[PDB]
Design a protein around this ligand. Structure first.
Ligand SMILES: [Mg+2]
Ligand SMILES: [Mg+2]
Ligand SMILES: [Mg+2]
Ligand SMILES: [Mg+2]
Ligand SMILES: [Mg+2]
Ligand SMILES: [Mg+2]
Ligand SMILES: [Mg+2]
Ligand SMILES: [Mg+2]
Ligand SMILES: [Mg+2]
Ligand SMILES: [Mg+2]
Ligand SMILES: [Mg+2]
Ligand SMILES: [Mg+2]
Ligand SMILES: [Mg+2]
Ligand SMILES: [Mg+2]
Ligand SMILES: [Mg+2]
Ligand SMILES: [Mg+2]
Ligand SMILES: [Mg+2]
Ligand SMILES: [Mg+2]
Ligand SMILES: [Mg+2]
Ligand SMILES: [Mg+2]
Ligand SMILES: [Mg+2]
Ligand SMILES: [Mg+2]
Ligand SMILES: [Mg+2]
Ligand SMILES: [Mg+2]
Lengths: 210, 46, 147, 102, 52, 203
RNA sequence: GGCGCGCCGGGCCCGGGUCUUCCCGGAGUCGGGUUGCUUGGGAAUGCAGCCCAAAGCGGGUGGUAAACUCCAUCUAAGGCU
RNA sequence: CAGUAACGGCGAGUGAACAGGGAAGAGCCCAGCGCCGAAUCCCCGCCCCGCGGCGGGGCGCGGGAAAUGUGGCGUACGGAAG
């Protein structure tokens, strides 16, 4: 029984909603429990990075977000192989791997290969038994100065290159951008049916040149 | 126990050629049949 | 606060703000938005026109990410870049023209609404409008496409 | 003229340099290895054909390709599986004709 | 019920406006004695002690 | 290896070799009883690819689920209510007869654990399924590391939580866009996550 | 109780790169018809009964049924965490 | 995301997912294809040790399981041999 003027609406309370209501009074108890667990884990993996493994530059999928770079899941096998890192040694020295990632470009692959080489420059690998160092172990000067870095290890921020102020060529001042957009729209829309009409026209050229 | 005497033989012989045999089992038999390393195949009927 | 509401002033008054003749019964016109075609016809004609019925094509698996293309105007095109780029471009006599990347700001399409100040520009957008492009050209400037 | 990279059009998209790696080893599944072809031809020489495909081989022997295709399309499923099974029965029946030839 | 809206949120600049008014009215000696603090022998009212 | 030939031979089922074999097996299985132990699997290759390693402690049963749909267990006609729920005769049951087979096999043997199961025969009025069963308190099972996962209390009566493959096929799960009404742990967990007000502290 | 450390008895005698030759996959299941339930899933999203019931450059997915033709993407019908 | 796409005497009502940000984060093993003299597993008896999660080592011309297939390498991220 609605009043004079006002938004008619569909409230989804026609079910029994009071029996299933999740209230958040343990929100700060949950936050304290999580940060107690985070401090306990971050001190039990004692010099290792608190954030976990390293995760690659990877680019968000869709049309809304492909200008943005995120931190992804794990380094691809192609990336690990170009960086020389064995796919089972990476998870031990602290590198996240997923086998599912493709590589369809070269710019992203070289970005991740550079990131892996930068990580292998930065990390301090302690010896396996401390009294007996080995060849692939970092030196005792920086074994003493190694510690936990907080935050994501080598954080990923979205850097935008700056293009300085050019003068404008008259080719740039005579590029017709709106007509070029609409003409590309029309060509990509009518590409197929023009192909079949060229097919039928050439076939009629066939049937009455033969 | 024949393999046990053979292993004791080579053990104390080192501390001091295999003969041809049947090959049982339908898996091993059909593998060497389809690789043609057999010469006769006896097949149980039941 | 229930200190300030209406049910305090309505103590003693027998009907509590809902009349003696027509009482406060439970649901006299149906639950919710009921009786749309039948007996609230005048409300749904006088206040929500166009409500009943279908119009247009059904798109099944819709994705706002596919249909995403936000807009900037020429009136706020110069907001996107700092003030010292404007005053260096006006101060400059060598004819060098600054490059406004609108996709870095996050707007895919340049529309042309307002006056644009008389400085040569290079607007590096994804899509353009005809009036946005021709106002950029008439000021002097270029329209660069980036996919 | 200037060809800018455009969001629409027939060659739309940001231009990136497509590298060429070998395709992943999940992709080769069901490529016919010669050993499984040998096993499968041995099994067919043991056990022979089904009744619906025998009746389809009678229709293909009388060369009624349309009713043979409609028959296999009903009694198998999709039209793609119908075409594939009709053409392997045509190959089987041609091999039988050549076996009767020489 | 338990799902009464017990908690209220305040805008951050309102909270900071309030913290600045609370600090700035703790220097005006009329506004501290009216709050009631027996204060007449304090040497100056923005009272600063050396951080020893 | 022989098992490739055995699986292609079992694949060809209207071949008259396999029609003769499945017919004579189905005759014998109808002459036998409903829930009886088989001494060794009838399809060793299918058993081995479903989990059976022929060692001590694995048991094959051979069980007979009666074939058909599911008419509604109500008195004479008489579902007392609205005409949507009037129907009794043409109703179908949510779980496969293979899962019902594993269910009553693992009910009849409660000391054992249903690994998986497979098909052996059918006729008009019965279907026959052979069920693979692991005895968890045997030490050839309990000392082997990659099969002592079955000996834990979480895996108690898999066939009744619906966790074997014949039970997982009836819960409507798996990756995809086809399986949106199970995202979460299950279908009920999907529904329960969707139909709750998350009334926050600060709203 | 666990993290520290020593001694005995016992296990394993393990790896990586390149080149050459081999080898590679889960069936009354997939899928189709029909019927009933369920789904926001609409010429049928999922589940099940009955009937048909495969393939191997195959097969599934590519939110409007179907044919043709390119592409893209995974590898089902086994299992643990 | 979204009371959206969609469903619904398209009436009342119903109604997800992708993408993005976070909590957390971990991967793996078979069957098959194979190659290794079944190289494998259980149980009984004795000797030593330890024993209130019956376990470690040795000896049994001790008994079974298993070729209708156990163990070792190997699983789609390919893998094996030389
Ligand atoms: Mg009123
Ligand atoms: Mg009054
Ligand atoms: Mg009133
Ligand atoms: Mg009254
Ligand atoms: Mg009234
Ligand atoms: Mg009246
Ligand atoms: Mg009311
Ligand atoms: Mg009326
Ligand atoms: Mg009703
Ligand atoms: Mg299914
Ligand atoms: Mg029902
Ligand atoms: Mg149901
Ligand atoms: Mg319904
Ligand atoms: Mg698998
Ligand atoms: Mg799986
Ligand atoms: Mg599980
Ligand atoms: Mg909104
Ligand atoms: Mg109506
Ligand atoms: Mg509902
Ligand atoms: Mg998401
Ligand atoms: Mg985090
Ligand atoms: Mg293994
Ligand atoms: Mg083996
Ligand atoms: Mg896989």
């Amino acid at each position: 029984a609605p009043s004079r003027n006002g938004m008619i609406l569909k409230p989804h309370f026609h079910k029994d909603w009071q029996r299933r209501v999740a209230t958040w009074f343990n929100q700060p108890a949950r936050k304290i429990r999580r940060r107690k667990a985070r401090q306990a884990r971050a001190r039990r993996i004692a010099p290792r990075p608190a954030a976990g493994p390293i995760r690659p530059i990877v680019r968000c999928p869709t049309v809304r977000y492909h200008t943005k770079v995120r931190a992804g899941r794990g380094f691809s096998l192609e990336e690990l192989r170009v960086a020389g890192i064995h796919k089972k040694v990476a998870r031990t020295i602290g590198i996240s791997v997923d086998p599912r990632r493709r590589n369809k470009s070269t710019e992203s692959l070289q970005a991740n290969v550079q990131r892996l080489k930068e990580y292998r420059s930065k990390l301090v690998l302690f010896p396996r038994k401390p009294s007996a160092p080995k060849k692939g172990d970092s030196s005792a000067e920086e074994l003493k100065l190694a510690t936990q870095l907080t935050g994501p290890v080598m954080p990923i921020r979205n850097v935008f290159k700056k293009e300085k102020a050019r003068v404008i060529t008259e080719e740039e001042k005579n590029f017709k951008a709106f007509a070029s957009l609409r003409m590309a729209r029309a060509n990509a829309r009518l590409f197929g049916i023009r192909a079949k009409r060229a097919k039928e026209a050439a076939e009629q050229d066939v049937e009455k040149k033969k | 126990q024949e393999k046990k005497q053979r292993l004791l033989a080579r053990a104390e012989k080192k501390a001091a050629k295999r003969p041809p045999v049947l090959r049982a089992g339908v898996n091993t038999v059909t593998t060497l049949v389809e690789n043609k390393k057999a010469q006769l195949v006896v097949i149980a009927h039941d | 606060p229930s200190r300030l509401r209406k049910t305090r002033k309505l103590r003693g008054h027998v009907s509590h703000g809902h009349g003696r003749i027509g009482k406060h019964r439970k649901h006299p016109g149906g639950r919710g938005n009921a009786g749309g075609m039948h007996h609230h016809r005048i409300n749904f004609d006088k206040y929500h026109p166009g409500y009943f019925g279908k119009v247009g094509m059904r798109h099944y698996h819709l994705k706002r990410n596919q249909s995403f293309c936000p807009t900037v105007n020429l009136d706020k095109l110069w907001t996107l870049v700092s003030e010292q780029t404007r005053v260096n471009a006006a101060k400059n006599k060598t004819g060098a023209a600054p490059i406004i990347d609108v996709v870095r700001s996050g707007y895919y399409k340049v529309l042309g609404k307002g006056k644009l100040p008389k400085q040569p520009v290079i607007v590096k957008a994804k899509f353009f409008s005809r009036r946005a492009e021709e106002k950029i050209k008439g000021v002097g400037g270029a329209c660069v496409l980036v996919a | 003229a200037l060809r800018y990279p455009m969001a629409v059009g027939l060659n739309k998209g940001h231009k990136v340099t497509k590298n060429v790696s070998k395709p992943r080893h999940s992709r080769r599944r069901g490529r016919l290895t010669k050993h499984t072809k040998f096993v499968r031809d041995m099994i067919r020489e043991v056990c022979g054909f089904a009744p619906y495909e025998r009746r389809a081989m009678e229709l293909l022997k009388v060369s009624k390709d349309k009713r043979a295709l409609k028959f296999i399309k009903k009694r198998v499923g999709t039209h793609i599986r119908a075409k594939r099974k009709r053409e392997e029965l045509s190959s089987v029946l041609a091999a039988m004709r050549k076996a009767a030839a020489k | 019920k338990t799902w009464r809206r017990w908690h209220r949120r305040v805008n951050t600049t309102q909270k900071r406006y309030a913290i600045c008014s609370a600090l700035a009215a703790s220097a005006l000696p009329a506004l501290v004695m009216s709050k009631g603090h027996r204060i007449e022998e304090v040497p100056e009212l923005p009272l600063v002690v050396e951080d020893k | 290896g022989a098992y490739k030939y055995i699986q292609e031979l079992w694949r060809k089922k209207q071949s008259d070799v396999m029609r003769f074999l499945l017919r004579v097996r189905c005759w014998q299985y109808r002459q036998l009883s409903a829930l009886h132990r088989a001494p060794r699997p009838t399809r060793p290759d299918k058993a081995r690819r479903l989990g059976y390693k022929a060692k001590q402690g694995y048991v094959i049963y051979r069980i007979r689920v009666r074939r058909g749909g599911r008419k509604r267990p109500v008195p004479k006609g008489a579902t007392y209510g609205k005409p949507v729920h009037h129907g009794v005769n043409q109703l179908k049951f949510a779980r496969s007869l293979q899962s019902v087979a594993e269910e009553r096999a693992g009910r009849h043997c409660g000391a054992l654990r249903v690994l998986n199961s497979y098909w052996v025969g059918e006729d008009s009025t019965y279907k026959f399924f052979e069920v693979i069963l692991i005895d968890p308190f045997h030490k050839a099972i309990r000392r082997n590391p990659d099969t002592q996962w079955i000996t834990k209390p979480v895996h108690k009566h898999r066939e009744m939580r619906g966790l074997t493959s014949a039970g997982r096929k009836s819960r409507g799960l798996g990756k995809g866009h086809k399986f949106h009404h199970t995202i979460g742990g299950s279908r009920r967990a999907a529904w329960r996550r969707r139909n709750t007000l998350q009334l926050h502290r600060y709203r």
